[PDB]
């Protein structure tokens, strides 16, 4: 497709604003935003995580004003994690730091990820352990082999459904995603402190080196996120993933395209 | 409101300078700056923190010289935490690092936050545990549901009162706050070290991408802050939040609007 | 060689895109991407690591479109580690963080390295302990002496074979590698947390101060990588290196040279 | 009113010096160290001895006699003797059985300022009931509000070995004629991270291009470099401090009224 | 001396490339790159480290092409050589935990390099002035208690290899006009080595007037310390481990008056 001129004027511009809720597993009616407590398999062969123990990628497909050639072009993003201060609840059934101490805060491995695209985020499967049996209700790499532990090119998918694609199975496919801008950080380690910044003064530019942002096919914008903040440790010592919602504000402009 | 030209001349500028004290809970007459010692509930459902155990957002509404259309526009900010060196008192009823050692310093989860606006900071409620029973004298998310643990759009508030809005319940609402600039960092983790920088040489510009700063409605400037530095651990092992004051210096100019 | 003008026009550019799989040791048919469990010799004298306990440098030689004097010049690189989220599998035969806790994540010493060159990466040998007996099937510093522990200029090699050059024996030779650009970070320490960033928005420019990138001799591009992410600790406490694949995308252009 | 800069060869001068730390110096052998830290039983009974309390360092440096005033334009600065912290073999508590001595580590405060007059201080107390010892200058008439902000506690850094670090900070409402920079890194296990180089310069000019102006032809340099604590074999801990190098370039500036 | 124009032309430029080996103590014929295991004295007064327990500064003086013209050092590429050797976690190390891999090299590090047209000038500072430094080392003489903070008598030149202990000496900031130095001490018993390698990074050696070190007598002085941390053996005893440093220096001919 040939990318031509940007439309100017009052109605040449639109704005998308929303939040994506985390999908941590939600083990019961009181635990939205948490996973089930983590259990450990005896062997690699017997790894069989339940669905409510697996955080999943979040995704929203957002319909844009009909243009039917013109396409909406995503230009700028403002984003942040919503509710960062909730992690200061150090008094709610947590394991004490020491005798008489406060509760341990959420900490340990985190994955913070967001993307803005003109089509679904394209995924590549990579498995820590190829013999893991993934549960019904999840979408996971099929026909896994030992090579799936490093790179098996069969594991291609689209992030096209909520509560479905487990975080541990899937990453953005760097061989694809031409029409998406993605950003992520895994911070591993059992004792890693959450470091969460909030401000309404920071913008991310979504244009590539040619001045072109994601172009929204069929007038749909795709927003994806993961914000696993770390693990909450309850009084018994059991640990659950804790996630938070992510705010998105995307500025878009009309762009003429040919063919 | 349409934003027009900035007024010039000697009388077209003003300066606001002040300290905002922390509101950590102040459990007795000797413990200003501290919270009550932290207790842990045995279940999520029984979480019922006492008021003096909950740090709150600080806020000051500052009257500006009367203009009564001209509005005061906040342009720059100098800010820092005041009393950073007090955290070196490692000899005062603290739990020793090890046998014969010095007292443990203030450490662990911190939240450092400041905002400057031409109206009250707008808040969105998010709850770690939606069944937490928040105490009388605090203002908290009402009609909480399990969805409040991730996002419930009913929980909207204004930071319009001191010693009232618990830090753990509320964040700046990213869907609002057009007329405020806010900045915050949460550093979690039980053993996290305070890293506190001071200088009189650093300035934050409050103008947006169109060159407009917060515009002060009714000639009032709103300053908000949280500076939970971490926890102090006493000899028994009990832990209390410790907070410090924040200095604000704001430069403002007169701006015509229509 | 005298470097002259760059060729222009649509056909003057080409792109290489591939992944390099990690070579961590692969101790059995199920453990691709892992090393063998780490054992410790009683003395420096008795240090004799298994082949499957030693991570190696990865390399790929990529043939480019035939030119002939013109040479392909590597200008830009996009690169990232593939499968960062796999390290969130904290439920598979791991040692618990504490009683009832989740499994320990991959952590500890890491080496992340990549290079792009117009010829094989040039290596210099440096040994932690010169008395280490390196195993059959590996290529290692020969005629080692006590000076090999700091600098022995005899230890020169080319990274010209996979599953061969152990990471711990070899580094890029800074006295050579004129025609390669290399980047690496060793983060040492038992409890170091992996910090892995992913994005499709970041480019590294490969041109030197004179504006000249690697020039591909015989129309071959050389890509090299190491991504030792840390160690996985199983239920017994034994530890194995865990590695991940690395994506490369290289933009090249035709450059005229003389002699 | 601040007018033009004087040019020519003698319109420029340089000040170079070392500021020694004032950590408490508990005996004739322990310069640079505090007394071992003792912990009070309660807040009420907190009564630190003088030699256990690090203080701010200050030097007033006379400039060439000169309305013209010397204007401080640039600063080069670093901690001197960073490598001494590698003495891990001198009466230290072992890291573990048969291990080396523990290095200096834990809470640090690194601070420096350059001004045309004494650094202005604001008092803030961790515990308002702390009894500060004779020989120190501390916040007077302390109340519970002193634990957060009591504006009565104003002072000038005008004496060495006198103003305890834990009691005092630069007063942000004042210090118009000073540039100050500091970092507190708290936490019992914090590692010292100390950079040295003769290639780094700090510009002291404000946004209007004016540096500190030296009243009475005197330049004020202040510092704190508490590097952390040294743990001896018994487990007792003392603050260890190091000297700070200052190189300040000054130029002659004409001023009115 | 007044600094004039840079000479141009093909032969007006030269390059120096070399490696400086670390001098960690080398306690026996198998332990080049290591110090002797660290022993701890009972008291400050009894501190008496053996020579092979003390890492020293490394120095090389490199002769340049014979030339008033002076060679001027303009740029530096440098890195630590053999960073991957620290991945040997299988050779007589102390296990991190039961059944685990050996502990890697970690704890206090000092990484330092300088480039000058004359010997690096040193200032002495002692952790403990009563330390008895061993024969074969060059150390601050006539030490007093003031040597623990600043004794201006302690002046030296880094003019000998395996001689000047790292812990005794630092670059003298009141001198070194004709040298550019850079160093980082990262203390702490468990500090992780973070070691970056690349052939794409250059340090410019010119001062604010655009003048680099000028090589007196046509000699270039390179100095380094790369104590990477401590290696812990099975018994728990710890030894410093160091690595070599690569230097590549570009120089140009500069005319100088008198």
Swiss-Prot record, chain E:
Q: Name one GO molecular function term.
A: structural molecule activity
Record-level GO BP terms: clathrin-dependent endocytosis of virus by host cell; virion attachment to host cell
Give the top-rank taxon of the lineage listed in the UniProt record for this protein: Viruses
Effect after changing residue 237 to F: In strain: Isolate MAD8-BR
Listed GO CC annotations: host cell nucleus; T=7 icosahedral viral capsid
Which UniProt keywords are listed?
Capsid protein, Clathrin-mediated endocytosis of virus by host, Disulfide bond, Host nucleus, Host-virus interaction, Late protein, Phosphoprotein, T=7 icosahedral capsid protein, Viral attachment to host cell, Viral penetration into host cytoplasm, Virion, Virus endocytosis by host, Virus entry into host cell
User: Where does it localize?
Assistant: Virion; Host nucleus
Mutation effect (residue 85 to T): In strain: Isolate YI, Isolate TKY-2A, Isolate MAD8-BR, Isolate N4, Isolate C1, Isolate CY, Isolate MY, Isolate AIC-1A and Isolate Tokyo-1
Membership in a protein family = Belongs to the polyomaviruses coat protein VP1 family.
Q: Summarize the protein's role.
A: Forms an icosahedral capsid with a T=7 symmetry and a 40 nm diameter. The capsid is composed of 72 pentamers linked to each other by disulfide bonds and associated with VP2 or VP3 proteins. Interacts with a N-linked glycoprotein containing terminal alpha(2-6)-linked sialic acids on the cell surface to provide virion attachment to target cell. The serotonergic receptor 5HT2AR also acts as a cellular receptor for JCV on human glial cells. Once attached, the virions enter predominantly by a ligand-inducible clathrin-dependent pathway and traffic to the ER.
Domain remark text = The intrinsically disordered C-terminal arm interacts with neighboring pentamers. The unstructured nature of this region allows to make different interactions depending on the structural context: pentamers present at the 12 icosahedral fivefold axes bind five pentamers, whereas pentamers present at the 60 icosahedral six-fold axes interact with six pentamers.
Quaternary structure, per UniProt, is: Homomultimer; disulfide-linked. The virus capsid is composed of 72 icosahedral units, each one composed of five disulfide-linked copies of VP1. Interacts with minor capsid proteins VP2 and VP3. Interacts with host 5HT2AR.
Record's protein name: Major capsid protein VP1
Which lineage? Viruses, Monodnaviria, Shotokuvirae, Cossaviricota, Papovaviricetes
């Amino acid at each position: 497709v040939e990318v031509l001129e940007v439309k100017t004027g009052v109605d040449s511009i639109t704005e998308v604003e929303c939040f994506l809720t985390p999908e941590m597993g939600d083990p019961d009616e009181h635990l939205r935003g948490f996973s089930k407590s983590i259990s450990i398999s005896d062997t690699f062969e017997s790894d069989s995580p339940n669905r409510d123990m697996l955080p999943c990628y979040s995704v929203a497909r957002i319909p844009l004003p009909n243009l039917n050639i013109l396409m909406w072009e995503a230009v700028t993003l403002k984003t942040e994690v919503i509710g960062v201060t909730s992690l200061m609840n150090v008094h709610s059934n947590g394991q004490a730091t020491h005798d008489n101490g406060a509760g341990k805060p959420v900490q340990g491995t985190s994955f913070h990820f967001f993307s803005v695209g003109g089509e679904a985020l394209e995924l590549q499967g990579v498995l820590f352990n190829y013999r893991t049996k993934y549960p019904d209700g999840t979408i996971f790499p099929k026909n896994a082999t030992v090579q799936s532990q490093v790179m098996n090119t069969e594991h291609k998918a689209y992030l096209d459904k909520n509560k479905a694609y487990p975080v541990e199975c899937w990453v953005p496919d760097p061989t694809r995603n031409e029409n998406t801008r993605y950003f992520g950080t895994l911070t591993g380690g059992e004792n890693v402190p959450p470091v969460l910044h909030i401000t309404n003064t920071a913008t991310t530019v979504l244009l590539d080196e040619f001045g072109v942002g994601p172009l929204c096919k069929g007038d749909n914008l795709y927003l994806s996120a993961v914000d696993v903040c770390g693990m909450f440790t309850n009084r018994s010592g059991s640990q659950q993933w804790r996630g938070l919602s992510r705010y998105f504000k995307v500025q878009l402009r009309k762009r003429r395209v040919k063919n």
